[PDB]
């Protein structure tokens, strides 16, 4: 509630994005890639204007011819050497041929055709080669070193904003899930992904799976273990999580496989992983239980792109979803058997994720349905950005800049909270009680908490600072606390927080030294 | 059989989906889209502030930017592209007369794709252009710009989906409902409405060959039953490809301001450009018409899925909704509360677009930054364009590509000023008749079939025509595309046309 | 007066000069063009008229 | 400083240079020459003045 | 390859009547300015000839 | 069969590097150090003008003059003023400074050497090895196998065509020169590939070889009881490639000092001919010639670690003092005047010739030896592959290859279980892909054990020959019931070792198939 005031306090679209949304919107950015996507439009309109027979003035392309393709394209290679995203696109080229084995001219020709974007979207639900690059890419980040590629597919949408808005409601045009059944939600989680499922239109009820701050906010053994209850039909989880921004660790990891294993085979995970990247040695849900789950990856984050709308929904080629499919009753599978009757001849054989395509644009409009050719494109482009970064130089170099961040921040708070293996810190929680204890002691640190509210500390530095930070969620009120997000703001804007509240710490401790 | 003979992505498309893809596109609003990215890459990379090898950038800054993309226009002005924005920033500074940094920040950051688009329902100064370009193509030339508004999606596939869910969503369009589709009309769009998602009835108002495909007054006024809740239009038409005649556009504004000012229209314009002096039902009927503007066709931008939901600012689907049962407005309440405090003044145009992300995500909905920036910019160029010379060397193509088709098959069917024929017809009749007289035109008809024909010329083209549809089977004939392939192509198609028809006259003559 | 040409269009019209960052973009004409004396000398008369004579630049310009 | 020298002179002789328009004319110079090193790092230096310090920029150049 | 085989004047004209593609190039043209929007261009064969001039020497 | 096997296996999959594989034990690197590459080409531009210089008629022929040393930095640091913004040239620059400030050489003999050296227009001179390049080449060298306590005015070195040519001429002289006899006792680090294994008991030479088996309990190092058989007197030389190829570890420090002693206390006139290629891609390699200077016949190849196997660049080093030297001291008044008449007409007190010194005579018939040593142009080649690895103080090109291998390593075992364990030792240009191992990690140790005996290693790769077009090296080395094969991570890319890999797995699921079904039987 003290969100439609503070708001009013400070207003920028940044502030209400967090607000809103509860999203930290990067003000850093993945250029090679994109100056990349740029280069290769000027080369794709040359091959466009190739095609043209007519004179005009106008300026009017045909479609790019595959024919010669590499010939022209590595002819453009050499002419602008001194380019950054012609070298790039030049690698890459070697990377899809040579490291992956694709055919290179029918790379190029799918990069070329696409970011013209002359051709609808095919197949729609990803195209050819860029499932296969982007594929590679999330594997990797995702942490499942034994997952087979040919075992993983993708499903290009808009964001990981589309892609919940589809997996709900293709989950329930499907009847995998019904008015009633249980959703497992690792909490705290921000607010739209509570929202969604207490819909009219959804009515499921949810069952807290609660992080402890005590485990900096892993979920304890007895918390992973209500998952165990067989009436509970999904597991729906952020990991790394948003607000608290740490990854769910090894123990956490096993918990639920076992789970599953043992007592859960038929349980449907849906993980919500675009933090993966800023986390050290991430594992995702999907690397651990690939049969049971859906992984929603958007490239919003980790390169900058909020604004190009780019994620993936993947499932492993065998899951349990289509397997909840085929159990279902003879009366509801001859009604679907109709629902997709175009799509195909046996609709018992339409996978799971190729209904999410279908469902996306009522069906009847599949063929033409998909994300945007040139967004996939740039999705490639992102992709092979990170995979022939051996060195994880911008991984690192990100993962620097959150820390420099952080060290800014605390400067005059104590120094940060000491940091563990499973920290990610997008979103870094400046807790009062914590800062005022490592400045002057716990029995400071028990006073000055019951002389503040979290509404109080927000509201001043929202007043002195113009910055209004999220309330903390996770414990029970008794701790007044905000959070901040390392990736929206820039240094003197961290110097300036910290500054209000050493200030506020100085105020509060002149008070206790005088009783 | 004749399923597979022909095999590829354009005879695909065509079949599986009613679409000629076009094989031709606009390339100076690319060429500057590119252009524009390259520049605001430099504007990102001047926000960073470490010393790196990475390749990485902040946000461009706002302060400064006009003088700086002057510096940067002066430099190109050899580049098709560079020359193109800088002609757009006058349009839209001095014509529009909009703010010109503002406009230059939201194309910079817009185009970086560095941030959500918002508002959600469309960036600001493109809403303000694309609706100025699409007021000037669809004629609706005594609407005032600000009382239409815009809702940017992902081509007219994520609209006609976006539209119906919110229809039934908000209960304007319950079961048991009828929807008057104007037919012939591709297949797509008989099917959304005969899903069981929605379960409403389908009454057809028939276009009449016999009148160049006009649909005559006793089926508009089909329209008048106050059971149709809504009517379904694509114009100009498709497969037909002709585009309402003003006897029509008017026939229909007299039924809906006389008999149902309730009337809710849903209008598929996309070929609208390809028309001679287009006017939209939007134009007529402001008040009871939601706009479907593909920008697919005219721009050849298919896969780059940009198009737009128009809506009056004061319209029957607000209407409507004010006409609900507080048993149905308390649930919609409930559903849009966490958007605004009083759901019940949350403008459809805007249900929208919360209802396209299961509205708790509406704040981040919308489509995507670049893709807008891409629309503008094609709005731009059609809207700089005063002598249309890009519309003129699309139709002037067409028409070389009907000719170079009919060249053996009696050239050509008489022209009318309602013709757009995106979509040819290719009718056996009126081939053989042309060729050889109403005498063994008569005699073929019925001695060939659709099917027959098809192959013909698919087994020695390669290509497959979709089966002419819309006048009692009794008429073999076949719909070509003038707009998916190239010149030698259709050569091909009429030759075996004609080599078909000489068989059959060899016979006649025997 | 090309920079104020609204429309697209071959035959060679253009607009009316806009005073707004003019002297940014005359500046930027001046440096591209040091090898030129009739350039060497529009911005020396800039400053005299700005400098010396205590008038607006903008304005001069 | 050239910019700010009023006459006609051979000697090579200059002015104060002028904080109007400062930040145009260094980010032209930018641009200009982003091949030569010190140059690209005057212009991140700026950058991190006025993005990481949050002090002003045209002050500052 | 016909156009710079063509332009460099090395071979003997082949076939003697015309050159292949360019015969097919030229007759396009030709039915369009005749205005014989009615025949199909591979119903018509052309005699490249020295000008109107040598074209009637020769038809005499 | 070993000897079979390999003839068969020839037939099922063709390919250069297959074959390579097979007939040569090596794996050719993808991969290759291009600036020095283009460094090379450009200073052969600036050189040819150099030339053009000094040709004093009109012609348009193209003819060119010696190239003149006089003025020579003034127009090289021209000629790099007037290139800065080409790859090579930049690096060329910068070597001149290495030469001239961090070895303290003379820079305008430095320069001349690479110029007139690249123009190959002069007989090598000194047939050795050219003066600056040996010093240089030498530095290298020096850093490069850990000999960081032997000053470097006691190495020297003889430039030959590749290890391949080294051999060829060692043997060769060390039988020339009585050092090596018929019947002599020739010890092998083992396992090594075949060729090292055919040459000595070649009918030329008629040695006996002396098996010093590594353990593979033991991570291929070599144990001590294994080592200890060297102090058998009977025992002439100590042949060894480490990092050894195909185990491709290098000897740990334990092996290294137990050897140390065994020279020390035991066998002081014991002669070592250690082949170290392998090196730079090992961690902290040390060489034998590291901790036996004087006892040990170095041979370093240029080839896998710039990807210049076509170049034939390689070096022989030997400590000016050294008991090849000792040994020839020690031969027979009656055999010395024999050598007396062999290497007369190169000098007057033939019994100081060095050894070294005869390497480079024998390999050309003696009679030869002012117009022997390896082509200028390829010492000049070598010198720049050598400046180039001493300039890049971060040793970032090393890193980048290892991780390069590292990559394949990990696409490789990605259906496997993961790479095995690596150690400090571990060099893994070649990996051992172990049937043993792989199944114990997917399934556990009892299938492990049931499939070892249900399989071979022609079984092994008969299957991925067969799957994937790639033919692998037989594992060999063990109480060879084990089915295992050799793959290098050098000479592929990423989706051929995940090709190789799938196979693999699919071999394993169905053994552990089979094995599932009798267990539940
Ligand atoms: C920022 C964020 C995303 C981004 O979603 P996109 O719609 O792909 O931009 C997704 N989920 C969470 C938890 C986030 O914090
Ligand atoms: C070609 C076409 C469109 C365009 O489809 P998008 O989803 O915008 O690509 C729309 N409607 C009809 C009737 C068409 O034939
Ligand atoms: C000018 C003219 C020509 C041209 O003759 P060429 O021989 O082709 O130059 C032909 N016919 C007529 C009647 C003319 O007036
Ligand atoms: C590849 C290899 C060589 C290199 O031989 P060169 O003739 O120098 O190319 C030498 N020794 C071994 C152990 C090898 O594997």
């Known amino acids: 509630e003290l969100k439609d005031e503070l708001i009013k306090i400070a207003s920028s679209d940044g502030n209400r994005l967090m607000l809103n949304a509860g999203r930290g919107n990067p003000n850093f950015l993945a250029t090679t890639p994109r100056r990349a996507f740029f280069r290769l439009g000027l080369f794709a309109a040359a091959e466009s204007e190739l095609s043209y027979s007519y004179m005009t003035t106008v300026g009017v392309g045909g479609l790019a011819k595959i ?21 790039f696109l030049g690698k890459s080229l070697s990377y899809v041929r040579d490291q992956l084995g ?59 904003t589309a892609a919940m808005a589809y997996i709900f409601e293709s989950l329930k045009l499907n009847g995998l899930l019904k008015a009633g059944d249980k959703v497992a939600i690792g909490m705290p989680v921000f607010t739209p992904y509570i929202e969604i499922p207490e819909l009219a239109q959804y009515a499921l009820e949810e069952v807290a799976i609660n992080a402890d701050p005590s485990l900096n906010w892993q979920y304890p053994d007895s918390e992973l273990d209500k998952l165990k209850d067989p009436a509970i039909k999904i597991f729906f989880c952020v990991n790394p999580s948003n607000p608290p921004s740490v990854k769910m660790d090894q123990r956490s990891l096993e918990r639920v496989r076992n789970i599953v294993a043992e007592h859960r085979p038929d349980l449907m995970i849906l993980t919500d992983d675009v933090y993966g990247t800023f986390a050290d040695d991430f594992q995702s849900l999907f690397a651990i239980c690939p049969e049971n789950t859906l992984l929603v990856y958007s490239f919003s984050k980790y390169f900058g792109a909020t604004g190009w709308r780019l994620g993936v929904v993947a499932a492993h080629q065998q899951n349990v979803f289509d397997l909840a499919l085929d159990k279902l009753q003879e009366s509801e599978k001859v009604a679907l058997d109709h629902r997709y009757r175009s799509l195909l001849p046996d609709v018992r054989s339409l996978k799971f994720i190729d209904r999410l395509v279908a469902d996306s644009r009522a069906v009847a409009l599949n063929h033409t349905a998909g994300l945007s050719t040139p967004q996939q494109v740039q999705m490639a482009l992102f992709s092979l950005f990170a995979l022939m970064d051996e060195a994880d130089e911008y991984k690192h170099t990100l993962k620097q800049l959150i820390r420099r961040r952080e060290t800014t921040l605390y400067r005059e708070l104590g120094m940060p909270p000491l940091r563990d293996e499973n920290a990610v810190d997008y979103y870094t929680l400046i807790d009062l009680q914590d800062v005022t204890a490592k400045l ?68 509060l401790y002149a008070e206790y030294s005088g009783q």
């Open 67 to 87: 024919d010669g393709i590499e010939g022209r394209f590595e002819r453009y290679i050499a002419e602008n050497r001194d380019q950054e995203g012609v070298r």
């Open 102 to 160: 694709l055919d290179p001219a029918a790379f190029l020709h799918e990069m070329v055709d696409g970011i013209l974007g002359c051709n609808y979207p095919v197949p729609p639900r990803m195209l050819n080669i860029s499932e296969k690059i982007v594929r590679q890419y999330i594997i990797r980040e995702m942490g499942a070193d034994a997952i087979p590629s040919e075992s993983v597919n993708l499903f290009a949408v808009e964001g990981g």
């Open 440 to 507: 002057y002691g716990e029995a400071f640190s028990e006073w000055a908490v019951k002389q503040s509210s979290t509404g109080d500390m927000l509201f001043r530095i929202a007043d002195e600072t113009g910055i209004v930070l999220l309330p903390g969620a996770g414990f029970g009120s008794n701790r007044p606390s905000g959070r901040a997000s390392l990736a929206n703001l820039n240094e003197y804007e961290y110097a300036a927080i910290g500054r209000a509240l050493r200030k506020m710490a100085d105020e």
